[PDB]
CSV table of C-alpha atoms and ligand atoms in Angstrom, one decimal:
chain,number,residue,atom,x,y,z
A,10,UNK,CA,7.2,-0.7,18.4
A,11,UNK,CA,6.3,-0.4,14.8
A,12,UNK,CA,8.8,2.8,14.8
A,13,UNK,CA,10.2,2.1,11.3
A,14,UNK,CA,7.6,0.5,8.1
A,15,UNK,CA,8.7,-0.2,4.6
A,16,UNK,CA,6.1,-0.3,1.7
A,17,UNK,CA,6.1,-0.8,-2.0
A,18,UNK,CA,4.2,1.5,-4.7
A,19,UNK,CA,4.8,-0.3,-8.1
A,20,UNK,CA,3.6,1.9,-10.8
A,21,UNK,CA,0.7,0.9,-13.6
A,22,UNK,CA,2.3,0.4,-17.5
A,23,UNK,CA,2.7,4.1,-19.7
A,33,UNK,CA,8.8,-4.9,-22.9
A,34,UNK,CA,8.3,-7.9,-20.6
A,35,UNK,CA,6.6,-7.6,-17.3
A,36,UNK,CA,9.5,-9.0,-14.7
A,37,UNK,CA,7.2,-8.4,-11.3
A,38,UNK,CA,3.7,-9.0,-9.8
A,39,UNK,CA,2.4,-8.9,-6.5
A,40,UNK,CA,0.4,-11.5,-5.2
A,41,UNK,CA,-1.2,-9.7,-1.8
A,42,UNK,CA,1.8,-8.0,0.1
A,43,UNK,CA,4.6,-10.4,-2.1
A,44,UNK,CA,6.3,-9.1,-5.3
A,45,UNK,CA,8.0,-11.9,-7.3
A,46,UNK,CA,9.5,-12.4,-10.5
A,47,UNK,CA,7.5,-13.9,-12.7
A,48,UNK,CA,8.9,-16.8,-14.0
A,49,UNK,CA,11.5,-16.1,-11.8
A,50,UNK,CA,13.2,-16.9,-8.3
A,51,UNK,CA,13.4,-13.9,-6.9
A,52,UNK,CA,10.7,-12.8,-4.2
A,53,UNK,CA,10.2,-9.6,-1.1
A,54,UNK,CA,7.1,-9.7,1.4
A,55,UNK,CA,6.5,-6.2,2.6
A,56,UNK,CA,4.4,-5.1,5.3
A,57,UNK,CA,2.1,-3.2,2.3
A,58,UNK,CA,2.6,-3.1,-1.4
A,59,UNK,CA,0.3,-0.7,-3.5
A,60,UNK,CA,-0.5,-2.4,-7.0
A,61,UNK,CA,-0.7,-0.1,-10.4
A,62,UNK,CA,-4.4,0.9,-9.6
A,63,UNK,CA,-4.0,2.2,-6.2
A,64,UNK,CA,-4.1,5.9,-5.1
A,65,UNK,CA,-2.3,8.6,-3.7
A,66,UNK,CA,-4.8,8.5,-1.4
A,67,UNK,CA,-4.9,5.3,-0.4
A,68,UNK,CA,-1.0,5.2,0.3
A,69,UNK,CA,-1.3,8.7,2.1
A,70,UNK,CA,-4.5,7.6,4.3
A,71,UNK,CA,-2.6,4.1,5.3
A,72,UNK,CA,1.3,5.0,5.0
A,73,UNK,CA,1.4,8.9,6.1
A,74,UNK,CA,-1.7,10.1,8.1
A,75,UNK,CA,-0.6,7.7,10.8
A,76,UNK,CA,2.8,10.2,11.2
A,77,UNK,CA,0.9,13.0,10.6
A,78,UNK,CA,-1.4,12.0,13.6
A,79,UNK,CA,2.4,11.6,15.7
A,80,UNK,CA,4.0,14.3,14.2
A,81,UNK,CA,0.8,16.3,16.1
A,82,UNK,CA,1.6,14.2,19.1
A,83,UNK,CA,5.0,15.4,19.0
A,84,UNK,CA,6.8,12.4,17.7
A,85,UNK,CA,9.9,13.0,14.9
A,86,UNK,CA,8.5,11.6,11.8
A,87,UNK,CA,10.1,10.9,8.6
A,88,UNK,CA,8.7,9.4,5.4
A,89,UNK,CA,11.5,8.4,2.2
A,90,UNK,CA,10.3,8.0,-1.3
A,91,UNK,CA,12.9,5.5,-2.6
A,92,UNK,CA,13.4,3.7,-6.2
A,93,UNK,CA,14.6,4.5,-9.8
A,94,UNK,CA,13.9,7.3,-12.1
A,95,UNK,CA,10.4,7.4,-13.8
A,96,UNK,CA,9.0,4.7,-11.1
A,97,UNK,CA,6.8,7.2,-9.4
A,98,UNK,CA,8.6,8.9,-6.3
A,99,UNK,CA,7.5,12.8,-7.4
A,100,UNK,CA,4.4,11.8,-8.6
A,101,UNK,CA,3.4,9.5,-5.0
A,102,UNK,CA,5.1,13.0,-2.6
A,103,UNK,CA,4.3,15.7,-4.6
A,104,UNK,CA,1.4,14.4,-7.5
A,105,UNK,CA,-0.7,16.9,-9.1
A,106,UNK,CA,-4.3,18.8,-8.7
A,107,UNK,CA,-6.2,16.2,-9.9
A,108,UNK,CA,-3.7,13.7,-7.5
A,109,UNK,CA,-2.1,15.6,-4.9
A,110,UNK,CA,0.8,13.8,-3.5
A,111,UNK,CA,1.9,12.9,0.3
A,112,UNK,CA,3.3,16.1,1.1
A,113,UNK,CA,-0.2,18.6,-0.3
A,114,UNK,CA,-1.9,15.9,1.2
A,115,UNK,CA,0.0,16.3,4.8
A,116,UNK,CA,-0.3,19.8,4.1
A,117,UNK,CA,-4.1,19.5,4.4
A,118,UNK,CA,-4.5,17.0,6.7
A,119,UNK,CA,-2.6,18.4,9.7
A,120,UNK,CA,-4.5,21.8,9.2
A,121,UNK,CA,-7.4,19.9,9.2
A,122,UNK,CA,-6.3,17.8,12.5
A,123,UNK,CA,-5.1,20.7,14.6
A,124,UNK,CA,-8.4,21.9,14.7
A,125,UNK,CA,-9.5,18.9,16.8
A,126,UNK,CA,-7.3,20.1,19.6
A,127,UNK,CA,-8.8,24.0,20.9
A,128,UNK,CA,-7.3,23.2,23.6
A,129,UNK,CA,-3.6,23.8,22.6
A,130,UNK,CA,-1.6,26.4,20.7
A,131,UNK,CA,-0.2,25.4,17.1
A,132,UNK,CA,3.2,27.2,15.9
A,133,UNK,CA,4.0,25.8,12.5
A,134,UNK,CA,6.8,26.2,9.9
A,135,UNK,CA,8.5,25.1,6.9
A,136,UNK,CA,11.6,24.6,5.1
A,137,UNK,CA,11.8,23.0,1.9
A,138,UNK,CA,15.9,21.8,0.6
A,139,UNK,CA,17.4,20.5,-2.4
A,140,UNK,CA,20.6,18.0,-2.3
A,141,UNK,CA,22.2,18.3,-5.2
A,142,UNK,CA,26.2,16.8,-6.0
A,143,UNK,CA,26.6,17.0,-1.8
A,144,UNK,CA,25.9,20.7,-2.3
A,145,UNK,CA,22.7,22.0,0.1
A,146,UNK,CA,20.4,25.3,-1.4
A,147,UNK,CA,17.2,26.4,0.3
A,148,UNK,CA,14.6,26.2,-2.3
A,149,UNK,CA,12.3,29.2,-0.2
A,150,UNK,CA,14.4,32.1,-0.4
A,151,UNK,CA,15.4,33.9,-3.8
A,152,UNK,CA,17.5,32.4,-6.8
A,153,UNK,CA,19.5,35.3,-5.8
A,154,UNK,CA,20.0,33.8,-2.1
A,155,UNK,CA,20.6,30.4,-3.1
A,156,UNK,CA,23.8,29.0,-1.3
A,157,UNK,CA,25.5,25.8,-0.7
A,158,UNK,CA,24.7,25.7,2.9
A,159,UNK,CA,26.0,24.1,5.9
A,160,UNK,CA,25.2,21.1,8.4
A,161,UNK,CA,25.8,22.1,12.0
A,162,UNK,CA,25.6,20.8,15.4
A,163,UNK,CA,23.6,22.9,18.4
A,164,UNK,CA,24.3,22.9,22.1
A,165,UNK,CA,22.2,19.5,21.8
A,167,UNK,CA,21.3,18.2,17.2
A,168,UNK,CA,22.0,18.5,13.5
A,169,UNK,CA,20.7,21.9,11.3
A,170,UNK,CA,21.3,23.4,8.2
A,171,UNK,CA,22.7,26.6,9.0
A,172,UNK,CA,20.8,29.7,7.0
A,173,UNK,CA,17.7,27.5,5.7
A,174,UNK,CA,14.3,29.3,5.8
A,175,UNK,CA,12.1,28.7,8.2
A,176,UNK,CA,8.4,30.2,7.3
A,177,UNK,CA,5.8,30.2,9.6
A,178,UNK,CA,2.3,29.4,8.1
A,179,UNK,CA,-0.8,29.4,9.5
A,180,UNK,CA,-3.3,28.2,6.5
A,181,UNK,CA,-2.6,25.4,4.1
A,182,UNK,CA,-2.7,28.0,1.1
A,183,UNK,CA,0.2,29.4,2.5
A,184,UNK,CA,1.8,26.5,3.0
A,185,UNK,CA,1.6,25.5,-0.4
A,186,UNK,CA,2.4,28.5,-1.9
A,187,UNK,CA,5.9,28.4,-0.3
A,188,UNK,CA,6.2,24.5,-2.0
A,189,UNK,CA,4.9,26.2,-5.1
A,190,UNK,CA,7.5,28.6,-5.0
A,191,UNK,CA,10.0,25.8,-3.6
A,192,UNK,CA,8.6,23.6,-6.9
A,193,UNK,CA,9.1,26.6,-9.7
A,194,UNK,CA,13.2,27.0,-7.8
A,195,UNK,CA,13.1,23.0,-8.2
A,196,UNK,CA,12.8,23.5,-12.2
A,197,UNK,CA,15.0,26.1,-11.9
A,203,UNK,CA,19.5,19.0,-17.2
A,204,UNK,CA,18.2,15.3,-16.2
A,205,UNK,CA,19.6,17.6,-12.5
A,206,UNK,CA,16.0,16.7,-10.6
A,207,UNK,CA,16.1,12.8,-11.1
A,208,UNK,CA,19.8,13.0,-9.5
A,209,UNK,CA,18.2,15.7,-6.8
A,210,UNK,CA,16.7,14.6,-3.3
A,211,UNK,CA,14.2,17.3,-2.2
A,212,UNK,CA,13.3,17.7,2.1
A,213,UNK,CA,10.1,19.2,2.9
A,214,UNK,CA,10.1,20.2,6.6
A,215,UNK,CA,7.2,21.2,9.3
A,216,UNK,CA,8.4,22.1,12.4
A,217,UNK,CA,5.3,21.6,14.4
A,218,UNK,CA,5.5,23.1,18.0
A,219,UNK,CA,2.3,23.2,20.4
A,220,UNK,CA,1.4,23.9,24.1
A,221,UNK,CA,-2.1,24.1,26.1
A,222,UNK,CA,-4.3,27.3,25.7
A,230,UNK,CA,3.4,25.3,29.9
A,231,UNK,CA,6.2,22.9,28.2
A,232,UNK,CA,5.9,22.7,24.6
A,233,UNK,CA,5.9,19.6,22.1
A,234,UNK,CA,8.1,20.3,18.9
A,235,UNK,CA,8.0,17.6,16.4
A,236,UNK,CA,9.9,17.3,13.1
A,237,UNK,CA,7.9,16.2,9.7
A,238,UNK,CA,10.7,15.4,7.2
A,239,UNK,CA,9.1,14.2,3.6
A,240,UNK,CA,11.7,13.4,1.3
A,241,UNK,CA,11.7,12.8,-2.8
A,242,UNK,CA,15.0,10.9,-2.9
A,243,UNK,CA,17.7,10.8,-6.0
A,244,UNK,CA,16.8,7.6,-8.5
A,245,UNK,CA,18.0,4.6,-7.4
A,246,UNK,CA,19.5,3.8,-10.3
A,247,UNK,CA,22.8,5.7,-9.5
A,248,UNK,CA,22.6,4.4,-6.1
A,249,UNK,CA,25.3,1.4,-6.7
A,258,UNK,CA,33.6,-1.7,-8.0
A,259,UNK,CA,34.0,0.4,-11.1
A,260,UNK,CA,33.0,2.7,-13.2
A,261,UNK,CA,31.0,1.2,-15.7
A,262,UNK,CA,28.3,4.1,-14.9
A,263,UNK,CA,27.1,6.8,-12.5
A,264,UNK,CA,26.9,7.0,-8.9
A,265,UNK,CA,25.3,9.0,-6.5
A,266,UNK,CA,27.4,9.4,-2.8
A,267,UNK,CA,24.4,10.2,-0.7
A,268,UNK,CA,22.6,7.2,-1.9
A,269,UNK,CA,25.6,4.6,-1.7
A,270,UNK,CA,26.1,5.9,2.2
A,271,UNK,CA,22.2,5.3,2.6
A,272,UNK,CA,22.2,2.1,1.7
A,273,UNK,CA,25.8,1.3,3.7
A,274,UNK,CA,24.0,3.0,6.8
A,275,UNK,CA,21.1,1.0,6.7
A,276,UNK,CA,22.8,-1.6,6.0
A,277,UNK,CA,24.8,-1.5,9.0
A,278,UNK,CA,21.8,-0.7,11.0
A,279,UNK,CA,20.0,-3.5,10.3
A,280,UNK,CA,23.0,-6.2,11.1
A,281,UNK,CA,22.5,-4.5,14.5
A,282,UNK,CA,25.2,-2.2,15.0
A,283,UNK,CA,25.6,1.4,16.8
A,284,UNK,CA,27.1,5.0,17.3
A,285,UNK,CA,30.8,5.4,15.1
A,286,UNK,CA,30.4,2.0,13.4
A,287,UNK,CA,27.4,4.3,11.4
A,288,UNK,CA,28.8,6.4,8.8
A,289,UNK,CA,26.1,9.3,8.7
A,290,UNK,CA,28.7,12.0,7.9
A,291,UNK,CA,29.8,10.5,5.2
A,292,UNK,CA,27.0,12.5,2.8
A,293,UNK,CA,24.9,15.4,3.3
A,294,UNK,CA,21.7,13.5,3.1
A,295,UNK,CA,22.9,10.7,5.8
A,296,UNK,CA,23.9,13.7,7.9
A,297,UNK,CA,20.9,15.9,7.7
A,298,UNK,CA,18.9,12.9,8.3
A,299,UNK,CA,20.7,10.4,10.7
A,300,UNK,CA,18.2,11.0,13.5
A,301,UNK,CA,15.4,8.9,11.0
A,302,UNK,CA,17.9,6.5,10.4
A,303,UNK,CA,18.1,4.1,13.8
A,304,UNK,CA,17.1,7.4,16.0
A,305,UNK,CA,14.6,9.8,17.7
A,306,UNK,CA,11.7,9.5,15.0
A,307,UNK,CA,8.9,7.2,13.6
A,308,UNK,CA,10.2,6.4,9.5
A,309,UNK,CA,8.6,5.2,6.5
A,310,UNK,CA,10.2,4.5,3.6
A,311,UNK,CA,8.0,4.5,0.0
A,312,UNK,CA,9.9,2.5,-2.2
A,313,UNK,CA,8.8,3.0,-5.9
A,314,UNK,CA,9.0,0.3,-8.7
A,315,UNK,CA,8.2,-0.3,-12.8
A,316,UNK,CA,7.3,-4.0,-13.2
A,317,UNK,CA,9.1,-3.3,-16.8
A,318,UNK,CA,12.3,-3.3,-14.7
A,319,UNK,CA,14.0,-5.9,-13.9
A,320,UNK,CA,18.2,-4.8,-12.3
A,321,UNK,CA,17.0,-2.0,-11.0
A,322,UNK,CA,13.5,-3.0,-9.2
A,323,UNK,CA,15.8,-6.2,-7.8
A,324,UNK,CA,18.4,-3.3,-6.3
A,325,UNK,CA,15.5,-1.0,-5.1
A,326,UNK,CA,13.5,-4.1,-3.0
A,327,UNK,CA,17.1,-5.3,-1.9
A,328,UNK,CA,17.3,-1.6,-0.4
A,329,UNK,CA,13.5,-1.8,0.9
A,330,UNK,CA,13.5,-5.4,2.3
A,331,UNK,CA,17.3,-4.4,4.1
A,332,UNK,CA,15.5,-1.1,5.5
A,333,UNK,CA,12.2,-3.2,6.9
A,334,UNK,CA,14.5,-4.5,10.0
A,335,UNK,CA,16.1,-1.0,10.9
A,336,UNK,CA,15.2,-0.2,14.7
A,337,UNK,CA,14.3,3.7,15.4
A,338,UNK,CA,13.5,4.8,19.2
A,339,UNK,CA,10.6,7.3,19.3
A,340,UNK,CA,9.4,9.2,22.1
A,341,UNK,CA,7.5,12.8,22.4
A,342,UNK,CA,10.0,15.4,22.5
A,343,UNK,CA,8.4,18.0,25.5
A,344,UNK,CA,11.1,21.1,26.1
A,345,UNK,CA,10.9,23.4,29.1
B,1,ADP,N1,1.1,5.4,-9.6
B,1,ADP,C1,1.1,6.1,-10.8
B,1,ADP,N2,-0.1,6.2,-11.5
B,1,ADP,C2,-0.1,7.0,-12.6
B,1,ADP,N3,1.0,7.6,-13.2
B,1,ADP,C3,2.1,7.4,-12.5
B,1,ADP,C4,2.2,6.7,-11.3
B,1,ADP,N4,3.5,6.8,-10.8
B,1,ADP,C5,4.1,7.5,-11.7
B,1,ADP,N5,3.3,7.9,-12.8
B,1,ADP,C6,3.8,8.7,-13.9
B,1,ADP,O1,5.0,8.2,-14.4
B,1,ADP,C7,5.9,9.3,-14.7
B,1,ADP,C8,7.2,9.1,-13.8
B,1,ADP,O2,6.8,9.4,-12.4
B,1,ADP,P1,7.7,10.3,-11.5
B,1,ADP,O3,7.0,10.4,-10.2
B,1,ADP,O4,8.0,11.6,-12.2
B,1,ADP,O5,9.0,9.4,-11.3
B,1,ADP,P2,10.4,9.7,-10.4
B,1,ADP,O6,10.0,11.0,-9.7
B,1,ADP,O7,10.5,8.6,-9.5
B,1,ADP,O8,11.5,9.9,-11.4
B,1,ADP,C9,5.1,10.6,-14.5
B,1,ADP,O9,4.6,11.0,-15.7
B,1,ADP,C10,4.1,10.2,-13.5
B,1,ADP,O10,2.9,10.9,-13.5
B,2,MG,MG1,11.0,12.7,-9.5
């Protein structure tokens, strides 16, 4: 299968160092606590790197037209924006994606390529579409279709370089910093990717999401917590004990909702969670979420329409 993978990114120093990682193990040092992971990514390892192992592999499926879904997860300032986005001198997953599939069509003159994208903000359960006007901006709704879940309204633009793809995330980005409001945000960047030969048609769904920090994600109020986040985590959760269908409580946030077929459904999902080593409560609740998440089962086949 292999349908669902779960990595660690732990970011290099900017206080006691809590974790290490010994091969694909991070422990406490000095400690009890330790989480093997399929991959972990120590402080010296690159965008690239995690891109060319973690996402190229569902880029490569996304082309075959498999779902595909890839999670940045873990606490403010650990490194989710900076591993999907990045910068010029280290583009991120999603410029990187960007690139690679306009790159990797090429290889296949034999079929047509329709691409287009959407780019979302989640923001206090309240959806806007970050590609249309300030002036446009709405909260938006999740609906069903005669099939599948959509957000009703969201721009779709169709883009046929990778300069014009990433001069809609630009514009997406500058919307983006449009107080503290992006560390409690989660971000979805979407390609649609439809092809047929030069006739059914494959249409995949790319999904790359920058979630909200962890560190709202979980009983009182002693502080802060994020909705979308704590349903994550309780759908997973539930997932992974091996239940099904109304047991899962995907409509119980926005993000869960929009998202439920990468959690235990169509697609092939990766989840990027981000750590500090200086952290210790909320590294231990952000592997907790990671290791939980390794054993979630997702069925993936090619979706081919008439
Ligand atoms: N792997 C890394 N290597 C170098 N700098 C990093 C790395 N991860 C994060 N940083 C830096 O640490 C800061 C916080 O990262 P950021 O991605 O903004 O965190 P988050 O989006 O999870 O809140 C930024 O200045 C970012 O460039
Ligand atoms: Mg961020």
């Amino acid at each position: 299968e292999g349908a669902v993978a779960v990595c660690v990114r732990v970011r290099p120093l900017n206080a006691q160092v809590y974790w290490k990682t010994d091969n694909n193990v991070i422990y406490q040092v000095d400690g009890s606590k330790s989480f093997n992971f399929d991959r972990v990514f120590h402080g010296n390892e690159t965008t690239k790197n995690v891109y060319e192992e973690i996402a190229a592999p569902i880029i490569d499926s996304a082309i075959q037209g498999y779902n595909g879904t890839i999670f940045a997860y873990g606490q403010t300032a650990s490194g989710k924006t900076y591993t999907m986005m990045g910068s010029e001198d280290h583009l991120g997953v999603i410029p990187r994606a960007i690139h690679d599939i306009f790159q990797k069509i090429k290889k296949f003159p034999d079929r047509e390529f329709l691409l287009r994208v959407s780019y979302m903000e989640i923001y206090n359960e309240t959806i806007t579409d970050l590609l249309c006007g300030t002036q446009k901006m709405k909260p938006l709704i999740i609906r069903e279709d005669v099939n599948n879940v959509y957000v009703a309204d969201l721009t779709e633009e169709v883009v046929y370089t990778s300069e014009m793809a990433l001069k809609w995330i630009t514009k997406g980005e500058k919307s983006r910093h449009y107080n503290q409001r992006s560390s409690r945000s989660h971000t979805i960047f979407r390609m649609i990717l439809e092809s047929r030969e030069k006739g059914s048609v494959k249409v995949s769904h790319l999904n790359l999401v920058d979630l909200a920090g962890s560190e709202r994600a979980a009983l009182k109020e002693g502080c802060n917590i994020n909705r979308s986040l704590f349903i994550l985590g309780q759908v997973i959760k539930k997932l992974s004990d091996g239940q099904v269908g109304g047991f899962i409580n995907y409509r119980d946030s926005k993000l869960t909702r929009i998202l439920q077929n990468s959690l235990g459904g169509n697609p092939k999902t990766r989840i990027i969670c981000t750590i500090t080593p200086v952290s210790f409560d909320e590294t231990l609740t952000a592997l907790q979420f990671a290791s939980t998440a390794k054993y979630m089962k997702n069925t993936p086949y090619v979706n081919e329409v008439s």
